[PDB]
Amino acid sequence: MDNQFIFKYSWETLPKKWVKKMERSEHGNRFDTNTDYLFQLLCFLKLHTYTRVQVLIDICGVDYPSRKRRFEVVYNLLSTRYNSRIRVQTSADEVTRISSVVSLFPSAGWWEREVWDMFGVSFINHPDLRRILTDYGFEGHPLRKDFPLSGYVQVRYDDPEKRVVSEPIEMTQEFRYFDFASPWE
Amino acid sequence: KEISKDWNTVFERSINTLFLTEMVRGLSLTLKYFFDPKVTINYPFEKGPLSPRFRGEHALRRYPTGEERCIACKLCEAVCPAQAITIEAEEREDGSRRTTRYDIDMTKCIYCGFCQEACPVDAIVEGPNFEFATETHEELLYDKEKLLENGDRWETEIAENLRSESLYR
Amino acid sequence: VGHLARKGTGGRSSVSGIVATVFGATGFLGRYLVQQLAKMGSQVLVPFRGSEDSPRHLKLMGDLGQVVPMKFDPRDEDSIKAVMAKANVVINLIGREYETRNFSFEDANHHIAEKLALVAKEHGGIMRYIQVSCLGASVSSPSRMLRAKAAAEEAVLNALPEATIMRPATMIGTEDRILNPWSMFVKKYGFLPLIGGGTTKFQPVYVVDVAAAIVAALKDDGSSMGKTYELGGPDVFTTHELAEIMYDMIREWPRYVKLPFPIAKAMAAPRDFMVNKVPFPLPSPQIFNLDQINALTTDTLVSDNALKFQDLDLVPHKLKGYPVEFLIQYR
Amino acid sequence: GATLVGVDKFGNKYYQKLGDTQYGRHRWVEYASKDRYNASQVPAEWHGWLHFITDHTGDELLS
Amino acid sequence: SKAAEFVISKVDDLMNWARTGSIWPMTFGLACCAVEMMHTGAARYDLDRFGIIFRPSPRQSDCMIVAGTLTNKMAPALRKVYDQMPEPRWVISMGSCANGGGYYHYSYSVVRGCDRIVPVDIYVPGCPPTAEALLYGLLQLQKKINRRKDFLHWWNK
Amino acid sequence: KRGEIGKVSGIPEEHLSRKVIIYSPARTATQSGSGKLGKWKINFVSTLKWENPLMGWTST
Amino acid sequence: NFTLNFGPQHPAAHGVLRLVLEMNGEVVERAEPHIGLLHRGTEKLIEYKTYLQALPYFDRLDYVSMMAQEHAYSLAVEKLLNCEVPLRAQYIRVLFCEITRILNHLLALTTHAMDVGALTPFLWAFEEREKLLEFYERVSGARMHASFIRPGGVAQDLPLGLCRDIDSFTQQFASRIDELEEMLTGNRIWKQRLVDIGTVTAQQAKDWGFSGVMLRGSGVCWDLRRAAPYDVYDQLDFDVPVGTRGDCYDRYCIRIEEMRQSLRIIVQCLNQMPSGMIKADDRKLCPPSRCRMKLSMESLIHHFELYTEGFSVPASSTYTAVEAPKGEFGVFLVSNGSNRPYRCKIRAPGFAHSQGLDFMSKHHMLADVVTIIGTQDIVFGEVDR
Amino acid sequence: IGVPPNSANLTEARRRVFDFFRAACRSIPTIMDIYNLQDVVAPSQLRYAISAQIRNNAHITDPKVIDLLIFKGMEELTDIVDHAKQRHHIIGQYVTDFLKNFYTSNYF
Amino acid sequence: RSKKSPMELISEVPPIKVDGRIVACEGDTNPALGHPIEFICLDLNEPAICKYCGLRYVQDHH
Ligand SMILES: CCCCCCCCCCCCCCCCCCCC(=O)O[C@H](COC(=O)CCCCCCCCCCCCCC)COP(=O)(O)OCCN
Ligand SMILES: NC(=O)C1=CN([C@@H]2O[C@H](COP(=O)(O)OP(=O)(O)OC[C@H]3O[C@@H](n4cnc5c(N)ncnc54)[C@H](OP(=O)(O)O)[C@@H]3O)[C@@H](O)[C@H]2O)C=CC1
Ligand SMILES: CCCCCCCCCCCC(=O)SCCNC(=O)CCNC(=O)[C@H](O)C(C)(C)COP(=O)(O)O
Ligand code: SF4
Ligand code: SF4
Numbered sequence A: 001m002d003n004q005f006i007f008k009y010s011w012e013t014l015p016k017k018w019v020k021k022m023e024r025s026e027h028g029n030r031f032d033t034n035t036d037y038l039f040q041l042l043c044f045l046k047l048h049t050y051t052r053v054q055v056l057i058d059i060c061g062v063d064y065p066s067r068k069r070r071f072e073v074v075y076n077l078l079s080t081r082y083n084s085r086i087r088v089q090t091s092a093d094e095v096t097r098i099s100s101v102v103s104l105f106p107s108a109g110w111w112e113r114e115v116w117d118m119f120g121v122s123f124i125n126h127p128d129l130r131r132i133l134t135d136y137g138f139e140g141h142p143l144r145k146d147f148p149l150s151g152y153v154q155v156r157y158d159d160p161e162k163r164v165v166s167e168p169i170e171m172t173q174e175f176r177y178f179d180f181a182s183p184w185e
Numbered sequence B: 001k002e003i004s005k006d007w008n009t010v011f012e013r014s015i016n017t018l019f020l021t022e023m024v025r026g027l028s029l030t031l032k033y034f035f036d037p038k039v040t041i042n043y044p045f046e047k048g049p050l051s052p053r054f055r056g057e058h059a060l061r062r063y064p065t066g067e068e069r070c071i072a073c074k075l076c077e078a079v080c081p082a083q084a085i086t087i088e089a090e091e092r093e094d095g096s097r098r099t100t101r102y103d104i105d106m107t108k109c110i111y112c113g114f115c116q117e118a119c120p121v122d123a124i125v126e127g128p129n130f131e132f133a134t135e136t137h138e139e140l141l142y143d144k145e146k147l148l149e150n151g152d153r154w155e156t157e158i159a160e161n162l163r164s165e166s167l168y169r
Numbered sequence C: 001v002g003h004l005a006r007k008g009t010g011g012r013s014s015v016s017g018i019v020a021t022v023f024g025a026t027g028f029l030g031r032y033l034v035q036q037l038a039k040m041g042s043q044v045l046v047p048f049r050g051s052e053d054s055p056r057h058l059k060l061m062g063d064l065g066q067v068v069p070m071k072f073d074p075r076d077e078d079s080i081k082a083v084m085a086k087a088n089v090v091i092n093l094i095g096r097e098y099e100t101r102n103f104s105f106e107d108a109n110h111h112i113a114e115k116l117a118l119v120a121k122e123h124g125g126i127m128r129y130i131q132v133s134c135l136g137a138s139v140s141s142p143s144r145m146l147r148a149k150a151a152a153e154e155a156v157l158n159a160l161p162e163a164t165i166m167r168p169a170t171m172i173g174t175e176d177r178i179l180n181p182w183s184m185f186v187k188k189y190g191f192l193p194l195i196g197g198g199t200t201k202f203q204p205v206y207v208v209d210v211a212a213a214i215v216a217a218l219k220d221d222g223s224s225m226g227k228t229y230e231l232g233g234p235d236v237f238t239t240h241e242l243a244e245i246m247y248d249m250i251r252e253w254p255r256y257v258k259l260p261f262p263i264a265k266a267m268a269a270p271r272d273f274m275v276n277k278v279p280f281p282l283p284s285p286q287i288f289n290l291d292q293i294n295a296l297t298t299d300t301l302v303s304d305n306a307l308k309f310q311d312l313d314l315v316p317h318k319l320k321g322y323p324v325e326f327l328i329q330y331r
Numbered sequence D: 001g002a003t004l005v006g007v008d009k010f011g012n013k014y015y016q017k018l019g020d021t022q023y024g025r026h027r028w029v030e031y032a033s034k035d036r037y038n039a040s041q042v043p044a045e046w047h048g049w050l051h052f053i054t055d056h057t058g059d060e061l062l063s
Numbered sequence E: 001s002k003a004a005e006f007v008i009s010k011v012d013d014l015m016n017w018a019r020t021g022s023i024w025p026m027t028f029g030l031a032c033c034a035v036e037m038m039h040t041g042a043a044r045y046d047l048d049r050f051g052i053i054f055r056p057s058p059r060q061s062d063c064m065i066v067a068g069t070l071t072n073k074m075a076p077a078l079r080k081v082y083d084q085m086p087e088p089r090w091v092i093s094m095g096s097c098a099n100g101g102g103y104y105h106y107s108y109s110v111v112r113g114c115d116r117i118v119p120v121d122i123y124v125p126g127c128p129p130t131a132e133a134l135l136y137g138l139l140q141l142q143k144k145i146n147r148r149k150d151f152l153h154w155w156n157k
Numbered sequence F: 001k002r003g004e005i006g007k008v009s010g011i012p013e014e015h016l017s018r019k020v021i022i023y024s025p026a027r028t029a030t031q032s033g034s035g036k037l038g039k040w041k042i043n044f045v046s047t048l049k050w051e052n053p054l055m056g057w058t059s060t
Numbered sequence G: 001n002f003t004l005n006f007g008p009q010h011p012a013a014h015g016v017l018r019l020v021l022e023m024n025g026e027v028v029e030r031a032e033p034h035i036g037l038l039h040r041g042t043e044k045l046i047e048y049k050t051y052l053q054a055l056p057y058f059d060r061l062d063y064v065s066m067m068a069q070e071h072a073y074s075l076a077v078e079k080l081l082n083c084e085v086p087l088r089a090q091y092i093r094v095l096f097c098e099i100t101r102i103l104n105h106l107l108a109l110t111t112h113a114m115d116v117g118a119l120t121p122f123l124w125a126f127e128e129r130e131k132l133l134e135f136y137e138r139v140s141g142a143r144m145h146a147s148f149i150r151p152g153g154v155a156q157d158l159p160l161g162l163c164r165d166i167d168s169f170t171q172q173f174a175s176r177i178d179e180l181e182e183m184l185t186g187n188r189i190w191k192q193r194l195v196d197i198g199t200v201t202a203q204q205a206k207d208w209g210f211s212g213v214m215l216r217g218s219g220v221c222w223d224l225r226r227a228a229p230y231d232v233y234d235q236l237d238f239d240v241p242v243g244t245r246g247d248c249y250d251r252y253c254i255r256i257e258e259m260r261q262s263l264r265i266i267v268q269c270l271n272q273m274p275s276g277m278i279k280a281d282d283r284k285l286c287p288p289s290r291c292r293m294k295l296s297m298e299s300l301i302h303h304f305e306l307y308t309e310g311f312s313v314p315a316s317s318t319y320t321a322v323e324a325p326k327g328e329f330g331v332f333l334v335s336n337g338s339n340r341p342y343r344c345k346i347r348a349p350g351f352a353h354s355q356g357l358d359f360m361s362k363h364h365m366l367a368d369v370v371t372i373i374g375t376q377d378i379v380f381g382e383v384d385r
Numbered sequence H: 001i002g003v004p005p006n007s008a009n010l011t012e013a014r015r016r017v018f019d020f021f022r023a024a025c026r027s028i029p030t031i032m033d034i035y036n037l038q039d040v041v042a043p044s045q046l047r048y049a050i051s052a053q054i055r056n057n058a059h060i061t062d063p064k065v066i067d068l069l070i071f072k073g074m075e076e077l078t079d080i081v082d083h084a085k086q087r088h089h090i091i092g093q094y095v096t097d098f099l100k101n102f103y104t105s106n107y108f
Numbered sequence I: 001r002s003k004k005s006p007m008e009l010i011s012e013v014p015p016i017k018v019d020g021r022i023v024a025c026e027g028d029t030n031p032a033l034g035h036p037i038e039f040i041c042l043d044l045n046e047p048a049i050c051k052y053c054g055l056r057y058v059q060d061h062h
């Protein structure tokens, strides 16, 4: 269906308290809702006849280290029947737990696990929530703006103990950051 | 109810599934390629085809007079996505802007050609050589003398490659 | 002083002006001494003589040229001087446990050590020199190898007065040459002969402790130069409970057989090495080494009035847990 | 040998065969030496001709 | 002992010829370099011509080809698999990621070179190396094997 | 004070006691534009940067 | 019940695959893949590099369809920048996307056949694959990781003799496809090793996010280049194959038909390709010609300022998706407004396909697991970003 | 099962702390006999080590921080239970001054 | 020969003779394969050195 038609219908049909912030543009229709109404909003968008969002594309995450709700998880959705694409995003925190959507879309389990791996945002009643991408025993969440690019620990082989061990990082050549940003912009 | 119940067609199907007609037809195809000429090439004597745009060994060209083309503009170092190029420069007593240390870590290099297409003087190029295979790691840290030796060795062909594709881009 | 210039945090990519020519680093102590040296950033040069793949397991220690293997010829004096040309410290560990059809006990230890010391003196740039001998290195010892070690360690002092001597005692490790053959021999047969008959006490030491002592002696330009340390373990073991502490993890069936000392030494030598000298590459000796039996005739405990670990403020590892843990792969 | 195309200062000789419509056995090298020949003896002038980079023989590329 | 020196020389030459004419590399390709190394084993740049056949297990493989990025989670597995190999045990580091960092070289989960886990003998650089580049690297490894007087060294020692 | 988020961040504990400087970088003298102002940054004092004794690269 | 683990080193499992699965002695009850062995860390690295320096990361994600990911990244940048592209650039981008589709389908089919046990089609498909890898090696430098597709247009113009050679290849590629298909479709072993294996229903594929061949295998006529045609695809006519019951065999037939459709599209692009410039005249994201940067002051200034600083994408955030050969490949850019991307999440199609292995391998036998792995065409560069 | 929602009060936080400590103890023998270590370390001292690690964060006041710390605790415990952590990682991980700093480096 | 570095090798090339107040230096005879064009005012009695190539231009007249 037409992008503006989704805009008008969804804004009129949806309960008013669910959507805190909403945006219409050519880039994509956006529904910024609260952290606790996310499950209900996703359930409504999944089952309603006119807005049949059946497949969840991915669960993203953006770190803004300048606001109280540092993280922002983004839910990209797709309506195969009506050929539309809606995007729902909420705000998170280092300690705030956000309800999972694995019950609706079973494919969201791995995306939620990787969001927890990268940003450290826990998900409520998520079955088997654990690190998926980083190695075993990893400390810190790499995709936060705080995490250094090179990390904190290295990996090498030590001969006294016949195994591969870990040390604090010792870079042979530091990452040269080139500051190309210029005024008049 | 998928049905093929006809007196004539049951005989036709029950023979194909009994005398291995599909197997024989797929078997006789390989024998066709058994007698066909092969597509391989003996590598050490015959080399595979390449292109004038091939991305291989880094080389530091120089002017036909004998002065090196590199002017320490440091565009190659800034554009290099892998951050493999390190440059140090100072003004010689002649007053010319030249490099003293221009070393490329060929183990970080990704052979993308961004450095080659960023030079305003065509100082650095990627020659057609693809046969490094050094036995030591620190031999792969080219250090502005290996670059110039490569440029001298491949100049007669790098110049031809550059002049052939200069009409492009 | 002038050398040992610290640069950055201690680690792989650190810097330390301890560019060293460690001789015999392809052996048992070498893979630990080089690891200790390169772990703190100091460059090390590893001169070898055999096949070029023997020291390739040492290149993992450093960072892009901190471990440079080089080839020499012990019979040629010029090459062994060339390998140490760009060095400010030399460590010598060259020594053979047994006879060789090309190198005798005197040639392997005493003559090589004398040549190395003279070459180092000629170079003039070796600020610290270390030559390593064994603990029971008395000149009157019946074993031929110990006499060669004594001659080498006395000649080194005359050649270089400011040359430390390190004297470990039957170091044990993952590929050591006193415990591994025992477990191997037990695996095929399992009766585990005791040549000495027990009650031959000595002090085993952990090889990592030996390497730590050597590197600490390198890192202190003080009351260590010229001194001859006597390295030893924390406990006074003997072959019986040493065999027990070996066998406990090995398990299966424990069997002990006692061989009288004189008949054992009179039987081991003829079968192993008394007349077979035609083939140059004669098979390496098993635990029936002729001189290892003679070395067991007297207790090799550390002298009470000599230098120890406590004089160099480090503690030995307890030879009951981690140091012997490598026997799980045998069990 | 359909055609022999030039020689080299190192002694390795260069041949050429022309096919009809399918690639294969177009141009190769006969190395002068035999001590494993290091697989890299073609000079810069003849390197382009061998890899089909340029149609110039290589002796012509020197001029 | 000059009379036998000919015998030792011939034995060494025969042993080196045997080890060079039949190399059975073990494929450890785990990134896009594995695709190029797979093209190398394909019909065009035939590896089987040079006596090179890939093995599925390390217990019967001569050398090991590390082709691809070596992350932190895979380095223990690489070391473990390298440990279960026979005496010759050569290692070839194909690709820019394997032979020291790579395009990434700055990451929480990338080992800056397979030479920090296993001792590498031949470095084949390229991102990704051409099949001809891998063939040249294997020829260089064969040349390295020729420089092995292992019987002579045993005799002299 | 209130290092609970620091405790749960998982970063090595020895790096939680680092002294940092907070400032807004000033406009460069060599340029007259003011398009790089008003943004604050934390300045960890990464003073120790020695030189690699193989090629002169700056290690850290 | 015992829980043995995979990790074979030969390329049967495409390498870098660790699979811990529990069986009931002969029948597998639950397979839990352990991804992360190839997590290079591209998502964190993109943020530290200019919009141009980050392009070659997209070659290293799905390294059988190199120009498919570059297409998605370039389209995302263009959508954020609002930059028009000349027709010739669009046509050549479509042509090379179809070539990537052919390459990826060939590689997937023959690795799947190698897993099953067939060996001959693998070598034939690679002797075919070289003839397109050399096409890649002609337009740009590298055979595999060709940074040919830039955000503005393409990197540089096609060589003079490329079109004739591409047409010559397409003359016989159909007969080569028929020769490869002769040994697999009619073969009775191939049917019995694929029929009734890994059945996925359309509702269940939609739930598990199986966009791609795994979706069309289940009877859903969902094609991203038909539903949301991005480049010049309305002009090109092609058919979208749809399976009847999706189980490891209708997917294979769909891949055959998609190879033929890609051949048809390549022929159409060759016939209909116009003449004109290849890079947009905006000159904010496209560099000047080498003859102009050495003659004109403004051109040299632009070259200097875009080969170091790069173009600055205005502050916004978009999600773009293209029909990669594996499936729906999506790049989600968040633009800070500077010359470096603030966040670039990459929606790899293989992630959901590998996630869906657990239910697809339910109550199957062990030999019916390698065929499931092969039939979904998973590569771990994209799965582990 | 699934992740618990949250803890409204500190009493629930203390209850979760006690449950995590109890579960870690009931999992202490399996990690004793899965890493093949019996005589090197007795099971008693690991209890004191876990108690010290738990008591380390005694100054935390926010219930959410307590919940997330406990969740990280279960994650680490579950990682240790499986044969996934490297060998003897656990035993290594779970075991005036001015002149001393001055003689080493300028950065202390 | 290789014992002559470009420093002491570019100085052995005699300065170019040209008429007029300024001269345009492009490096190679093909403009696309040289350096960016560099107009130099050769008014002083010393030869005017191109900053890219290092070639020296001097005024034949006067
Ligand atoms: C010239 C010298 C050559 C010497 C070598 C001999 C030729 C060898 C050629 C071998 C080439 C194919 C080799 C493939 C090996 C594997 C193929 C096995 C496939 C198979 O077993 O198929 C079965 C039928 O095979 C069969 O039934 C095979 C037996 C043939 C039966 C006889 C057929 C005609 C009978 C007429 C009798 C006339 C005389 C009467 C008086 C049934 O396949 P399915 O699984 O689909 O079945 C559904 C039931 N579950
Ligand atoms: N740690 C211990 O158990 C004891 C140590 N020691 C002393 O410490 C040294 C190390 O003990 P160990 O580790 O058993 O020594 P090894 O038996 O391990 O061999 C040590 C090194 O000596 C080298 N070497 C031997 N003969 C010659 C030679 N003729 N010319 C040149 N190099 C030679 C070997 O090189 P290649 O392998 O190439 O021959 C080897 O790398 C002993 O030699 C001994 O002097 C004393 C008592 C016991
Ligand atoms: C092999 C082991 C596997 C697991 C290893 C895990 C090791 C780390 C364990 C987790 C570390 C954590 O911080 S996770 C648990 C963190 N929870 C807390 O720190 C609670 C704060 N303290 C209090 O509430 C009280 O003071 C209290 C001290 C409880 C009682 O004292 P009182 O009653 O007087 O009040
Ligand atoms: S871009 Fe070219 S001229 Fe500039 S510094 Fe690099 S090599 Fe030298
Ligand atoms: S090819 Fe690319 S990675 Fe290599 S030096 Fe040039 S710009 Fe850097």
Ligand code: SF4
Binding pocket: E031, E032, E033, E067, E068, E069, E094, E095, E096, E097, E098, E102, E103, E126, E127, E128, E129, G060
């Ligand atoms: S060298 Fe290049 S192609 Fe090979 S694994 Fe690394 S990034 Fe991929």
Ligand SMILES: [Zn+2]
Binding pocket: I025, I026, I027, I035, I038, I050, I051, I052, I053, I054, I055
């Ligand atoms: Zn000029």
